[PDB]
Amino acid sequence: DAEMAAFGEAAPYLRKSEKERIEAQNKPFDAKSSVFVVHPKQSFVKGTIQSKEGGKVTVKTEGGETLTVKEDQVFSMNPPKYDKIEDMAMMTHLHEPAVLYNLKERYAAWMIYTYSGLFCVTVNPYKWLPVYNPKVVLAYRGKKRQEAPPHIFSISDNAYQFMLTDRENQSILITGESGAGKTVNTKRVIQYFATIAASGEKKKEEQSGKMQGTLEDQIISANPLLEAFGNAKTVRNDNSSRFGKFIRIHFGATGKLASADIETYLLEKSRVTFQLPAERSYHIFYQIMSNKKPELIDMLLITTNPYDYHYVSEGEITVPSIDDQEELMATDSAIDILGFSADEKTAIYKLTGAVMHYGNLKFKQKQREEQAEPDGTEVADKAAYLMGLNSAELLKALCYPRVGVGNEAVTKGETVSEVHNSVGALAKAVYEKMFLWMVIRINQQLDTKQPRQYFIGVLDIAGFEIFDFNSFEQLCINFTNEKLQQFFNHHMFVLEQEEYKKEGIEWEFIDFGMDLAACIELIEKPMGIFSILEEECMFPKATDTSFKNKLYDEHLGKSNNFQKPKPAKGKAEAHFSLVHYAGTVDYNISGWLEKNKDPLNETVIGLYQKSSVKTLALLFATYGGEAEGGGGKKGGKKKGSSFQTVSALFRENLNKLMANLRSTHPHFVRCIIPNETKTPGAMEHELVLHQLRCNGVLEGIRICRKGFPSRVLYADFKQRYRVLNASAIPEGQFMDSKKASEKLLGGGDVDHTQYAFGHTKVFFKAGLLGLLEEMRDDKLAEIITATQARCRGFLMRVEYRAMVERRESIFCIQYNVRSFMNVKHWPWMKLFFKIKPLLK
Template sequence: MIKCNVICFLIEKLKVVAKASNVNPKDPEFPSSGVEDMTRLAYLHEPGVLQNLKCRFDMNEIYTYTANILIAVNPFQRLPHLYANNMMEKYKGAALGELSPHPFAIADSAYRQMINEKISQAILVSGESGAGKTESTKMLMQYLAFMGGQNSNTEERSVEQKVLESNPVLEAFGNAKTVRNNNSSRFGKFVEIQFNEWGRISGAAIRTYLLERSRVCQVSDPERNYHCFYMLCAAPAEDVEKYKLGNPRTFHYLNQSNCIDLDVLDDSKEYLETRRAMDVVGINQAEQESIFRVVAGILHLGNVEFAKGKETDAAEPKDVKSRLHLKTVSELFMCDEKSLEDSLVKRIIVTRGESITKALDPDTAALSRDALAKIVYSKLFDWLVEKINISIGQDPKSKFLIGVLDIYGFESFKTNSFEQFCINLTNEKLQQHFNQHVFKMEQEEYKKEEIDWSYIEFVDNQDILDLIEKKPGGIIALLDEACMFPRSTHETFAEKLYQTFKDHKRFIKPKLARTDFTICHYAGDVSIFMLWHSNEPHLGFT
């Protein structure tokens, strides 16, 4: 059994302007420096919470408690003094609330409860994109490694060292610059740290979710593709020459955005750091060479363009330059060049045991190329995670575990697609868990104990979850149904949604849109853009 009793919430700095008619009462004794625990506020309403967070933020106090929940306001700067080893010693064994709010206190509380109550724990890190979830997750894992480390003097890397060093590897291949965050995690991660009966780390497992595959081929300005592509282009000269690379602007998968370099990130230095981290987690030199061959191959694959061939509606590589890139891809992927070309410009349809080869037009061949790039990259990422898990090792005899969840934050961009749809669904489920944990369960406990209290109103988001995932009749169920019909398009699917949910308060059909739809999430309205992919019908929309 896992006891999930510690939740870490992160938000960005907020600014709210209220109408005079909506002003809430203010505590006349509210201290100018704010309070460390917001349960001490006389009025626990939104303006009171925001005022308290602002007062503390202005004093460089970025952490605040709400009972056993830690709220962190992203300072958008490095504060190394807050996370030094002497700070970990300070929080070791201290009761939650005894010292200033800090992620170390949350991690220590989870560790102590695991030891004392003999129950596994989980820490949830939630918040909007760019709020600082990944950095906070690192701090939590750093403290757990400090508390449960084996202190081995042997040359062999310890489990906790491998767990910590897995972060730069996963960030290199799973993180990217977005509009709101220079190092945004484009995947979800759940780390299970296993402990023996003496409270020492004996194993670990990393589980990943929802890698944003579309980013490999489609990058919006001023965002970037995954860090590893730019790192490899900035690698030492011998590696750049080996993989036939050069200026990242010469590659289609990277030049869709004007953002190539980051002031806060030295790609050449990060490349060397990633290689060093790979050594630590047990990825040998031969495997590292294979990994970066695949990364380089994907870049060259994106530069293969198509034009009409000799046959009607048949595609072929556009020119000598495209054929050269195709040849390079086959060398890097170690496959036959002609077979690779055929896989891009032809499709094999099997009907009643008979195989029919159909030539693809240039546009469809380009989609096929992009689909291959996305699948290869996602398989590479999955292999990396599996390799790291094998290297770290799991302990089947472990007594307890502490799980740390670092999942995508809520997202709402100018153009929102299937990734945002899935990410926001995940955040809705986390929000429901928060509601269940903080509001429903607590108030039910008050009722049982006959405590006199004022009922706290909260927004129950069950109706949004039903809208999306209810079976039958939810959006995902209707999408599965549409994918079973060969003549389905994004127009027919959208029309089905409009008819089914025309009276649903959480579903809106934009006035000028023919196929888009808007979902009214707990954190705001998000409009989803749809485009049917004929070669990836299971995605439904891009």
């Protein structure tokens, strides 16, 4: 309360009033009866234990329901002291339910940031909050996470701190499902950096501030370009990230901004050509056809009605929450700031329209032949011109692909179906490349000469998602995540072990990563999936089926993580399941071989390679330089620098990454999505539960509980408990951030067993907190019983003062009555009586 001011307005969403707290922690609780329990419809609901069937349990509900469930379908419930705990990992009850429940409660209260160990859980508000508030930004500035409530800037600042304090590079790993809202965070983190450590001095003035011509802006401006090209309306989000990314913010020596570095991973090439019914393609398209810059429409030779471009109107065209017109400029302007040449800025556009046109390219069967022949030179003409090509040459290459089988170049004829498909392949190919280029070009501007001493990497990618249908793309992502996870499990193992070393506890344990090495080797190692995948790609006459068998003959029965599918449930077909940390994933191998080969009509590429549109020409260069290497039929593309695998890079890139991640001090952020239905203050259970498993959150709790569940960070320990032996615990905490907590525990009639210290934190049992209380319980009997007595004593002590006072007033009353009883019958007195009145 006193503290909170900085936020003030945000406060309510960060922390609760000091009595709201108090009114919550200090309330009646019946441990032995209060519990969490399994539940057929709702995941886990709370209840009170009624009876006990010797190994069955009957419980009441909170809604009113009675169920008799197993002994282990029943889970304890944390004392009220742990209501809306900033760090669930401090709880003395490391369960599945308690975690779900904590998140949930502090959300219904509008607190989106709750920590779960090292993580920084984040829940989609689905509404607006004063959190990103320009006041907060400062507030979180220079504060350990124990000096402030759960928030992302905490993570983000600490990184910075740590950056300069330890002289190590840092990282932030943001991860969640499609609708979790990571971009948003990522972006928000980024602003944070830019703000708190900028100072271009000259660039700071209110004169076209943030326009092209400064980075802090470039840095920023970056996003809105990428977003136009790599973002789209998903059925979950309205601006979903259809690719992954890694930015390196290169801080200087002083500590002020110096450089940036983007890298893109796994772009959703398919959107370019397809789209689900409730979705839509990349924005750009819709941006452009919006008509805010009419020249563009005529320049590209298109219309404003998307239904003229099959490729981009298979799903939806308009989204209410998006103003395509505004963005177009945003985009536009960003390009400029980004330093692109008008020409390039022209290529981009012109090139983005060609692609639309391609999808309009039509063909027909030559008569009496099964060959494809152009169905007109209306569109080709446009595509051709827009790309700096020749209509004819183009349609030929497309129709009569001139190949090179043997030591020559053999002209091959294609079918209608073959063309339509090849076209689509280029459309996608071109878009991609371009996108890649843009990134590079961005990076290029984001390159300064100033020295760099450290960087802070911000990684944004998807998390392990399980679908009834898992294809190639899923493997690639899952694999990424299963790696990332191990990356953590280790950091934690390293980390943990420091405490027990700092404190002096005697705990031995094996790396937690190790548990996952099994799965990883199976994928990335030599006779593993990828290899078998990338070898077969060399066999001119291999089949998905072929590949499949090779997969089995070699891994089946011999490998544990390897399994043959469970074809039924919500799944669509059979091929192979894997046993990832998050669970079993059923993978379908169909298209892999192809997808992995990235087959492109080289004749056409030829044309690109010699376009009048330099940029287009450029994008293709690297294909043109490896052809030397795969001159004759069969063989190896790599000889000339051409990719041999769809997967060959992914790995290379994923390695270059995980390596960059190592020379880093990992900082974790887990983004969460409350309800599919888009409702603030709500949460489907099992939906959040899922995420938690695949997040790493539930695995961090596990590793924590091995053991000594709740683990308190030292400052977080000082503040909250100094008050217990106030003098001696405060001194300890202040005198040595760690040594303090040590010193503190000096007092209390508590089990000096139940805990254990170490380099970054204390370890504590539960049934520990349970132990604590008990001691406490006895200590009040003392306190009370004694306080009762005095009272009791004192109580009667006042009775004597009254008894005594009364002493005479009674007598007076006593005797006085007696008189009368005697008198009232006496003549003389009756006389006086009748007579007493006549007097005066």
